Amino acid sequence: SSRPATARKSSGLSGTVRIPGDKSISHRSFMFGGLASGETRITGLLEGEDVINTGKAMQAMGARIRKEGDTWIIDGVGNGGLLAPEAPLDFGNAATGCRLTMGLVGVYDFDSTFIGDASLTKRPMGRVLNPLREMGVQVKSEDGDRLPVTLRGPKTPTPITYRVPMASAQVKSAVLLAGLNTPGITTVIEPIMTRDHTEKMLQGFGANLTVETDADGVRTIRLEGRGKLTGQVIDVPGDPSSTAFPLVAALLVPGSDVTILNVLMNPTRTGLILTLQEMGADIEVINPRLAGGEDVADLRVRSSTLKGVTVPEDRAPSMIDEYPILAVAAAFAEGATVMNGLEELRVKESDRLSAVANGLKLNGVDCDEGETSLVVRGRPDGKGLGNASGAAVATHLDHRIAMSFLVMGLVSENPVTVDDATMIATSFPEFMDLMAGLGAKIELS
Ligand SMILES: C[C@](O[C@@H]1CC(C(=O)O)=C[C@@H](OP(=O)(O)O)[C@H]1O)(C(=O)O)P(=O)(O)O
């Protein structure tokens, strides 16, 4: 079952908080630490449900994982050393874990089965299963290439050169991870850059992986297969997608001044910040530095008056998971915010385009949902927004829909209710406590 929650108008958010670790990097830390030779030590790991599921999948294949103090320590099996799992690998709500693991173990000569929850089971897997079929993996999937899926790798996989058709870092990642156990050179060509945690981290683990960018922006990523991977010390930066929630809340709630510490600032993750700055947001980037091999900074966010802007389709990959919270900010901006190139939103935990549009309408917002776009016209004073009758936003098992609308309720004249807050812990278990500490009033049923 589910647990609804209602957000109420706040008098001002204020404080300094450390945001939880980056989910993308956390997933990969468990995966690469579990695969590599020797020991990997991780500090700052996100302990949300999605990451825990990836950890259990790696344990199922032979890695030993334990938490000593505040450090997760992993004893890896070495490249080529994964063991056949006894039972299905349950990824719950996590597409990142599921899709990357399909590439990782699908190329091994044993059977592996992938299952997940009601939301993950409806998402498309063909985007990863097709290149695996080219590599020689035998695939048994449900119609439409959906879970459950059982893979059986060939004795010797075939390396491929794959041009990713949509701006998916998960597809690029799955093909590169498959390349780790494939003899020869695996090449991934990305016409538009997507988050590059896989490339940066594999290089950090010693992989002979190179990235070449043409002047036209196309990336050619080459990986030599069956090479040694060496355990590493990892310091996980703060999640920029989780940061988006208290950050947008601070921009919208009058009388706010919130500082978020140690936030990942890799440009493939900062499209929302750039967009909000263009809308007039007061976001100060403090002490930009290098930590754990990544760019991080502290962000001081203050109440701002926002104006609608046009968000180009090519910025989408750099902020794809932040469209829900951006749409909420647009609900309080002067004028229209226009966002196109949103086809990928329809295949996430929920069809995010439909869920955001329906949630906004339920809460009095004037918006137009297109097949691949969203136009939102705001009401800066928040008058008439929210839902006085207490009607609940349908979250469709999507944690980001739940968090985005709860942020809306801190600003709207009328409270905003979401039908379920139980999935928030998949990526941000600290959400309720963190927001409450800043002054937000959110009542869990
Ligand atoms: C959607 C989501 O976040 C995704 C995680 C992810 C990664 O490699 O770590 C890449 C993107 O997916 P894609 O563009 O390759 O399809 C994100 O949207 C996910 O984990 O599935 P999140 O919203 O649940 O964080």
Side-chain angles (χ1 to χ4, degrees), residues 47-108:
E47 292 181 11
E49 299 177 2
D50 281 9
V51 179
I52 298 307
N53 285 326
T54 292
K56 292 173 182 177
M58 295 308 300
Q59 292 176 296
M61 294 181 286
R64 304 173 212 177
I65 298 176
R66 71 187 191 268
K67 187 181 184 183
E68 190 178 83
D70 298 317
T71 306
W72 282 87
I73 302 174
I74 306 179
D75 294 298
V77 303
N79 198 9
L82 295 173
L83 308 175
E86 298 188 333
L89 300 178
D90 185 359
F91 285 93
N93 195 246
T96 299
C98 183
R99 292 194 181 122
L100 272 60
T101 303
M102 286 176 157
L104 180 69
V105 308
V107 288
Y108 281 70

XYZ file of all heavy atoms in Angstrom, residues 47-108:
444
model
N 22.380 5.698 0.684
C 21.814 4.464 1.211
C 20.324 4.287 0.924
O 19.602 3.605 1.653
C 22.138 4.336 2.711
C 23.661 4.105 2.916
C 24.077 3.950 4.375
O 23.195 3.815 5.238
O 25.294 3.953 4.664
N 19.889 4.863 -0.186
C 18.503 4.719 -0.597
C 18.249 3.313 -1.115
O 19.191 2.596 -1.444
N 16.977 2.921 -1.220
C 16.611 1.578 -1.670
C 17.189 1.132 -3.006
O 17.570 -0.025 -3.150
C 15.090 1.422 -1.711
C 14.440 1.617 -0.355
C 12.916 1.532 -0.387
O 12.320 1.275 -1.470
O 12.312 1.732 0.696
N 17.211 2.021 -3.995
C 17.761 1.681 -5.301
C 19.194 1.156 -5.192
O 19.517 0.132 -5.787
C 17.767 2.896 -6.238
C 16.402 3.187 -6.854
O 15.382 2.576 -6.451
O 16.351 4.058 -7.746
N 20.034 1.846 -4.417
C 21.442 1.470 -4.263
C 21.583 0.183 -3.488
O 22.396 -0.677 -3.842
C 22.241 2.626 -3.603
C 23.719 2.228 -3.406
C 22.126 3.873 -4.506
N 20.782 0.024 -2.445
C 20.827 -1.212 -1.680
C 20.521 -2.412 -2.597
O 21.174 -3.456 -2.493
C 19.840 -1.144 -0.502
C 20.256 -0.003 0.437
C 19.759 -2.495 0.199
C 21.709 -0.028 0.924
N 19.571 -2.264 -3.516
C 19.264 -3.353 -4.430
C 20.436 -3.708 -5.330
O 20.662 -4.884 -5.624
C 18.017 -3.037 -5.250
C 16.772 -3.193 -4.420
O 16.720 -4.066 -3.542
N 15.779 -2.365 -4.661
N 21.173 -2.705 -5.786
C 22.355 -3.001 -6.583
C 23.380 -3.747 -5.722
O 24.018 -4.709 -6.192
C 22.970 -1.724 -7.121
O 22.060 -1.176 -8.076
C 24.310 -1.991 -7.797
N 23.533 -3.319 -4.472
C 24.481 -3.989 -3.582
C 24.123 -5.466 -3.409
O 24.993 -6.342 -3.467
N 22.840 -5.760 -3.218
C 22.416 -7.150 -3.059
C 22.646 -7.983 -4.333
O 22.928 -9.183 -4.253
C 20.950 -7.201 -2.646
C 20.709 -6.669 -1.235
C 19.221 -6.578 -0.945
C 18.959 -6.008 0.456
N 17.490 -5.838 0.758
N 22.537 -7.355 -5.509
C 22.783 -8.070 -6.767
C 24.262 -8.427 -6.871
O 24.607 -9.525 -7.329
C 22.379 -7.213 -7.967
N 25.145 -7.510 -6.467
C 26.580 -7.790 -6.537
C 26.956 -8.895 -5.540
O 27.789 -9.753 -5.836
C 27.392 -6.529 -6.269
C 27.198 -5.444 -7.346
S 27.451 -5.954 -9.082
C 29.189 -6.511 -9.088
N 26.349 -8.872 -4.362
C 26.603 -9.929 -3.369
C 26.164 -11.285 -3.925
O 26.835 -12.303 -3.705
C 25.822 -9.659 -2.086
C 26.293 -8.469 -1.322
C 25.401 -8.211 -0.120
O 24.212 -7.903 -0.266
N 25.963 -8.352 1.075
N 25.042 -11.293 -4.644
C 24.511 -12.501 -5.246
C 25.464 -13.113 -6.282
O 25.353 -14.301 -6.604
C 23.165 -12.210 -5.883
N 26.382 -12.298 -6.801
C 27.351 -12.735 -7.798
C 28.772 -12.871 -7.244
O 29.755 -12.976 -7.998
C 27.295 -11.808 -9.025
C 25.952 -11.948 -9.746
S 25.812 -10.924 -11.222
C 25.604 -9.289 -10.489
N 28.885 -12.884 -5.917
C 30.184 -13.119 -5.303
C 30.949 -12.017 -4.607
O 31.965 -12.301 -3.980
N 30.487 -10.778 -4.707
C 31.199 -9.688 -4.038
C 30.820 -9.686 -2.567
O 29.729 -10.118 -2.208
C 30.844 -8.337 -4.673
N 31.733 -9.267 -1.707
C 31.391 -9.168 -0.293
C 31.290 -7.681 0.005
O 32.183 -6.891 -0.327
C 32.446 -9.849 0.576
C 32.643 -11.307 0.181
C 33.811 -11.930 0.927
N 34.489 -12.947 0.126
C 35.579 -13.593 0.527
N 36.101 -13.320 1.719
N 36.153 -14.500 -0.264
N 30.175 -7.292 0.610
C 29.939 -5.902 0.934
C 29.637 -5.771 2.414
O 28.886 -6.578 2.980
C 28.740 -5.355 0.119
C 29.066 -5.438 -1.379
C 28.419 -3.923 0.554
C 27.904 -5.005 -2.271
N 30.222 -4.762 3.051
C 29.997 -4.538 4.471
C 30.173 -3.057 4.764
O 30.850 -2.334 3.997
C 30.993 -5.358 5.310
C 32.451 -4.851 5.238
C 33.385 -5.800 5.957
N 34.736 -5.276 6.169
C 35.748 -5.458 5.321
N 35.558 -6.145 4.199
N 36.952 -4.972 5.609
N 29.553 -2.597 5.855
C 29.684 -1.204 6.268
C 30.416 -1.142 7.616
O 29.920 -1.646 8.634
C 28.305 -0.544 6.416
C 28.416 0.984 6.682
C 27.065 1.682 6.848
C 27.279 3.201 7.014
N 26.003 3.946 7.257
N 31.584 -0.516 7.604
C 32.419 -0.374 8.800
C 32.457 1.105 9.133
O 33.068 1.884 8.408
C 33.830 -0.882 8.489
C 34.724 -1.015 9.692
C 36.085 -1.562 9.309
O 36.937 -0.770 8.872
O 36.289 -2.788 9.416
N 31.804 1.509 10.223
C 31.777 2.921 10.553
C 30.963 3.602 9.464
O 29.854 3.151 9.155
N 31.498 4.654 8.860
C 30.764 5.332 7.793
C 31.305 4.946 6.416
O 31.002 5.618 5.427
C 30.883 6.844 7.965
C 30.288 7.319 9.256
O 29.200 6.849 9.608
O 30.908 8.170 9.918
N 32.067 3.854 6.345
C 32.665 3.427 5.075
C 32.141 2.088 4.571
O 32.099 1.111 5.317
C 34.199 3.288 5.209
O 34.749 4.512 5.718
C 34.845 2.960 3.854
N 31.721 2.039 3.310
C 31.282 0.775 2.750
C 32.549 0.166 2.161
O 33.276 0.825 1.423
C 30.194 0.988 1.679
C 28.864 1.268 2.294
C 28.367 2.475 2.669
C 27.874 0.294 2.651
N 27.117 2.320 3.247
C 26.793 0.990 3.240
C 27.798 -1.103 2.530
C 25.641 0.341 3.701
C 26.652 -1.752 2.993
C 25.590 -1.029 3.568
N 32.839 -1.072 2.539
C 34.041 -1.759 2.072
C 33.594 -2.935 1.229
O 32.758 -3.733 1.649
C 34.908 -2.247 3.265
C 35.302 -1.046 4.142
C 36.220 -2.873 2.739
C 36.028 -1.410 5.424
N 34.150 -3.035 0.030
C 33.780 -4.095 -0.889
C 34.979 -4.936 -1.290
O 36.036 -4.395 -1.614
C 33.162 -3.507 -2.175
C 31.997 -2.564 -1.812
C 32.704 -4.652 -3.098
C 31.313 -1.906 -2.995
N 34.818 -6.254 -1.233
C 35.868 -7.167 -1.676
C 35.392 -7.677 -3.024
O 34.428 -8.454 -3.107
C 36.044 -8.326 -0.691
C 36.556 -7.855 0.644
O 37.684 -7.308 0.695
O 35.815 -8.009 1.633
N 36.061 -7.222 -4.078
C 35.679 -7.593 -5.426
C 36.113 -8.964 -5.889
O 37.012 -9.564 -5.312
N 35.508 -9.424 -6.975
C 35.817 -10.743 -7.531
C 36.867 -10.702 -8.648
O 37.405 -11.754 -9.050
C 34.535 -11.428 -8.089
C 33.460 -11.544 -6.996
C 33.979 -10.641 -9.288
N 37.167 -9.497 -9.136
C 38.103 -9.317 -10.234
C 37.365 -9.388 -11.574
O 36.400 -10.137 -11.718
N 37.813 -8.621 -12.567
C 37.141 -8.642 -13.866
C 37.080 -10.083 -14.383
O 38.072 -10.806 -14.341
C 37.876 -7.744 -14.876
C 36.999 -7.387 -16.084
O 35.792 -7.671 -16.094
N 37.596 -6.767 -17.100
N 35.910 -10.494 -14.851
C 35.733 -11.851 -15.345
C 35.380 -12.842 -14.239
O 35.144 -14.032 -14.511
N 35.312 -12.350 -13.004
C 35.045 -13.230 -11.863
C 33.652 -13.346 -11.271
O 33.475 -14.024 -10.261
N 32.659 -12.725 -11.891
C 31.301 -12.803 -11.369
C 30.811 -14.247 -11.402
O 31.126 -15.008 -12.332
C 30.361 -11.913 -12.188
C 30.650 -10.412 -12.098
C 29.767 -9.662 -13.095
C 30.419 -9.911 -10.694
N 30.046 -14.609 -10.374
C 29.503 -15.950 -10.222
C 28.020 -15.965 -10.570
O 27.304 -14.988 -10.332
C 29.704 -16.420 -8.773
C 31.130 -16.321 -8.216
C 31.129 -16.699 -6.738
C 32.056 -17.225 -9.023
N 27.555 -17.078 -11.126
C 26.160 -17.211 -11.521
C 25.219 -17.036 -10.323
O 25.351 -17.726 -9.304
C 25.943 -18.601 -12.182
N 24.260 -16.104 -10.412
C 23.351 -15.921 -9.275
C 22.389 -17.108 -9.129
O 21.958 -17.689 -10.132
C 22.629 -14.601 -9.601
C 22.628 -14.591 -11.086
C 23.998 -15.119 -11.478
N 22.073 -17.468 -7.883
C 21.179 -18.596 -7.607
C 19.745 -18.259 -7.923
O 18.962 -19.127 -8.295
C 21.186 -18.977 -6.123
C 22.483 -19.435 -5.541
C 22.273 -19.964 -4.132
O 21.308 -19.525 -3.461
O 23.076 -20.812 -3.703
N 19.388 -16.997 -7.728
C 18.018 -16.587 -7.934
C 17.947 -15.284 -8.725
O 18.983 -14.666 -9.001
C 17.336 -16.413 -6.561
N 16.727 -14.857 -9.099
C 16.600 -13.613 -9.856
C 17.203 -12.433 -9.116
O 17.207 -12.378 -7.878
C 15.091 -13.461 -10.029
C 14.636 -14.909 -10.150
C 15.423 -15.549 -9.009
N 17.716 -11.491 -9.898
C 18.303 -10.264 -9.373
C 17.138 -9.280 -9.313
O 16.597 -8.890 -10.352
C 19.385 -9.761 -10.332
C 20.545 -10.743 -10.551
C 21.530 -10.147 -11.562
C 21.242 -11.029 -9.217
N 16.753 -8.903 -8.100
C 15.618 -8.017 -7.882
C 16.072 -6.577 -7.780
O 16.681 -6.169 -6.790
C 14.905 -8.471 -6.613
C 13.622 -7.698 -6.341
O 13.258 -6.785 -7.117
O 12.974 -8.032 -5.326
N 15.774 -5.794 -8.813
C 16.200 -4.416 -8.808
C 15.164 -3.439 -8.303
O 15.407 -2.213 -8.290
C 16.728 -4.022 -10.199
C 18.086 -4.589 -10.473
C 18.221 -5.800 -11.130
C 19.236 -3.959 -9.974
C 19.471 -6.384 -11.291
C 20.495 -4.539 -10.129
C 20.612 -5.752 -10.785
N 14.036 -3.982 -7.846
C 12.992 -3.129 -7.309
C 12.571 -2.006 -8.240
O 12.041 -2.273 -9.310
N 12.820 -0.756 -7.851
C 12.430 0.414 -8.658
C 13.581 0.953 -9.505
O 13.387 1.907 -10.258
C 11.996 1.537 -7.693
C 11.233 2.658 -8.371
O 11.716 3.799 -8.450
N 10.028 2.349 -8.857
N 14.762 0.338 -9.381
C 15.984 0.862 -10.009
C 16.408 0.473 -11.421
O 17.078 -0.556 -11.615
C 17.166 0.605 -9.036
N 16.091 1.327 -12.392
C 16.481 1.050 -13.782
C 17.997 1.116 -13.946
O 18.581 0.359 -14.734
C 15.836 2.035 -14.716
N 18.640 2.029 -13.226
C 20.093 2.142 -13.330
C 20.755 0.816 -12.971
O 21.598 0.302 -13.708
C 20.639 3.224 -12.395
O 20.082 4.492 -12.756
C 22.152 3.286 -12.507
N 20.382 0.256 -11.830
C 20.977 -1.014 -11.450
C 20.647 -2.109 -12.446
O 21.519 -2.875 -12.878
N 19.379 -2.183 -12.831
C 18.932 -3.216 -13.755
C 19.603 -3.144 -15.120
O 20.176 -4.131 -15.594
C 17.413 -3.120 -13.915
S 16.680 -4.369 -14.970
N 19.557 -1.978 -15.749
C 20.130 -1.859 -17.083
C 21.634 -2.017 -17.124
O 22.174 -2.666 -18.025
C 19.692 -0.549 -17.696
C 18.185 -0.532 -17.993
C 17.869 0.602 -18.896
N 16.449 0.754 -19.236
C 15.740 1.860 -18.989
N 16.306 2.891 -18.375
N 14.497 1.979 -19.434
N 22.332 -1.440 -16.153
C 23.783 -1.594 -16.152
C 24.177 -3.040 -15.841
O 25.130 -3.578 -16.433
C 24.432 -0.630 -15.147
C 24.792 0.776 -15.666
C 23.533 1.525 -16.183
C 25.482 1.555 -14.521
N 23.443 -3.699 -14.940
C 23.791 -5.074 -14.593
C 23.506 -6.033 -15.742
O 24.209 -7.043 -15.893
C 23.098 -5.491 -13.290
O 23.481 -4.564 -12.270
C 23.538 -6.881 -12.842
N 22.497 -5.717 -16.562
C 22.199 -6.543 -17.744
C 23.435 -6.577 -18.643
O 23.826 -7.625 -19.158
C 21.007 -5.961 -18.529
C 19.688 -6.212 -17.826
S 18.338 -5.420 -18.729
C 16.925 -6.452 -18.117
N 24.041 -5.420 -18.854
C 25.231 -5.379 -19.681
C 26.389 -6.063 -18.981
O 27.149 -6.819 -19.596
N 26.520 -5.813 -17.680
C 27.625 -6.385 -16.924
C 27.639 -7.905 -16.926
O 28.650 -8.512 -17.249
C 27.586 -5.881 -15.473
C 28.686 -6.383 -14.539
C 30.012 -5.757 -14.990
C 28.381 -5.960 -13.100
N 26.518 -8.523 -16.579
C 26.523 -9.978 -16.494
C 25.912 -10.726 -17.662
O 26.092 -11.937 -17.765
C 25.888 -10.457 -15.151
C 26.554 -9.731 -13.999
C 24.405 -10.225 -15.135
N 25.193 -10.019 -18.540
C 24.610 -10.671 -19.708
C 25.649 -11.338 -20.601
O 25.335 -12.309 -21.297
N 26.875 -10.818 -20.590
C 27.969 -11.362 -21.401
C 28.690 -12.548 -20.756
O 29.643 -13.076 -21.330
C 29.029 -10.287 -21.767
C 28.465 -9.320 -22.787
C 29.503 -9.540 -20.500
N 28.248 -12.961 -19.570
C 28.838 -14.127 -18.910
C 28.074 -15.383 -19.339
O 26.853 -15.359 -19.553
C 28.778 -14.003 -17.385
C 29.852 -13.117 -16.796
C 29.834 -11.734 -16.987
C 30.898 -13.662 -16.045
C 30.835 -10.919 -16.443
C 31.895 -12.852 -15.502
C 31.853 -11.483 -15.706
O 32.836 -10.677 -15.158
